With several copies, the nearest count.
Chain A
Amino acid sequence: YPHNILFTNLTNDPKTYNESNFVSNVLEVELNDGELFVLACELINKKCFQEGKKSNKIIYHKNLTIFKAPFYVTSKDVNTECTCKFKNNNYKIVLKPKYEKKVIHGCNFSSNVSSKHTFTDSLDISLVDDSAHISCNVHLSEPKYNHLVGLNCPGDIIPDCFFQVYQPESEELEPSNIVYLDSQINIGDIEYYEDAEGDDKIKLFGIVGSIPKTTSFTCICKKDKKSAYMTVTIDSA
């Protein structure tokens, strides 16, 4: 009993889409987050994924192509035009994700305001004291999660976030170490994303579902003699 996926039977030998669903031999299919598109037809040039005025995962098999829609994108209308053939007809499939302004739950330490990304919190590190260490806290407490957590650091980051993260602060005199985010939040499906706007590096990760236990971690951002750190806290149950 599956759902979400879309199947395009355009050959001979689950929402089913066929020739009837085309308009003037065009299929303006609008994919959603974590939605798997499937087609079964002999493509013209054995290839599709391009620009037409971004494929995370595409598997090309004989007379069959599987595509999973990505979870984060900033392009308004980034499309893919699978041009196929069946019988004596030529059909084209235009895939495009639903435009949604996903707001990154994190701290923008940079000062540029013409960024392609939107952060819930922000702290211009360039204004911070030299030889200082200011915090920018971030918290989450939803039953189910579908969020993007990251930061925009104009300088070096510590550690490699968010594949590696920094353990939370100890009340007693105990050390805090660097761990892999996989083990820290104790889930499997962790998407990772990286981007760069000039000197500003921006690294983030996606979380989907409900976490096992309420967990917290930290990521450190330094620029010249100034420094800062973002503390994240996600709640279970």
Chain B
Amino acid sequence: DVKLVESGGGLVKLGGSLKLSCAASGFTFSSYYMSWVRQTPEKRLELVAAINNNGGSTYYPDTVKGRFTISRDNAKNTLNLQMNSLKSEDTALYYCTRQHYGNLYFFDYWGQGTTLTVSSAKTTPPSVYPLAPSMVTLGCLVKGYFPEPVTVTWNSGSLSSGVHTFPAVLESDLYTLSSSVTVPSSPWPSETVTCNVAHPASSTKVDKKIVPR
């Protein structure tokens, strides 16, 4: 099966540079137009760069022309994008997708994407705060961390039903989110309920047992 695997994304400071690579498998890489397409936080799709089957000619929209540079190694079945002078606007999830003149330049295959974050904010660990006071609803406030992601689980994953993990938001420059779990009145506080917040960027794991006020 056709497969495209982006890699190399992460956090880059303002003005920095980063190279993203894409691994292709399961088709004749040399016969398809490759292209990097990114998805903004506004969930809009934008073509970053594109290249022809033989790697000769390339196009870059004026927004990134000169800054970024697409490239392909057909011997290694790889597609590379050297992005330089990165600005905050470049913060997006970058997809590696293909096209063919014989399918009316249709994007029939896309990778899962690699996430690029262009910011100068310093990596900050989270501060877990418990949220405590029929189906009683408990909470778990994750406050003041950077950057995304953060994994919030309840009872090490066993508590899955009735769990809403709201998206994160920028306070001043740090993220803040919360997770709402709803269990009946019987299992709480008789049986324990704990939210497990992990922040891999800061190498931090927190487990806060929710107790009554």
Residues in chain A within 8 A of chain B (CB atoms): 131-135, 158, 166, 169, 171-173, 175-176, 218, 220, 222, 227-229
Chain B interface residue bracket vs A: 10 to 19
Of all chain A residues, the one with the shortest Cβ separation from B58 is: A173
Q: B58 and A133: CB pair below 8 A?
A: no
Whether a CB of chain A sits under 8 angstroms from the CB of B104 is yes
Contact of A131 among B2, B52, B101 (CB under 8 A): B2
Q: B101 and A169: CB pair below 8 A?
A: yes
Q: B27 and A132: CB pair below 8 A?
A: yes
Question: B58: which A residues are within 8 A, CB to CB?
Answer: 173
Residues in chain B within 8 A of chain A (CB atoms): 2, 27-28, 31, 50-52, 56-59, 100-105, 108-109
Q: B52 and A173: CB pair below 8 A?
A: yes
Q: A220 and B102: CB pair below 8 A?
A: yes
Of all chain A residues, the one with the shortest Cβ separation from B2 is: A131
Contact of B100 among A133, A158, A166, A172 (CB under 8 A): A133
Of all chain A residues, the one with the shortest Cβ separation from B105 is: A175
Q: Contacts A131-B108, A173-B50 given: A228-B57 contact, CB under 8 Å?
A: no
Question: A175: which B residues are within 8 A, CB to CB?
Answer: 105
Say how far A233's CB is from chain B's closest CB, in angstroms.
15
Q: A227 and B101: CB pair below 8 A?
A: no
Q: Contacts A131-B108, A133-B31, A171-B57 given: A176-B52 contact, CB under 8 Å?
A: no
Contact of B103 among A171, A172, A227 (CB under 8 A): A227
Q: Contacts A173-B50, A173-B57, A173-B59 given: A131-B27 contact, CB under 8 Å?
A: yes
Question: A131: which B residues are within 8 A, CB to CB?
Answer: 2, 27, 108-109
Say how far B139's CB is from chain A's closest CB, in angstroms.
47
Say how far A164's CB is from chain B's closest CB, in angstroms.
12
Q: Contacts A131-B2, A131-B108, A132-B27 given: A220-B59 contact, CB under 8 Å?
A: no
Complex CA gap A173/B61 in Å reads 12
Q: Can you identify 20 A-B contacts, CB atoms within 8 angstroms?
A: A131-B27, A131-B108, A132-B28, A133-B31, A133-B100, A133-B103, A166-B104, A171-B56, A171-B57, A172-B57, A173-B52, A173-B58, A173-B59, A176-B101, A218-B101, A220-B102, A220-B103, A220-B104, A227-B102, A227-B103
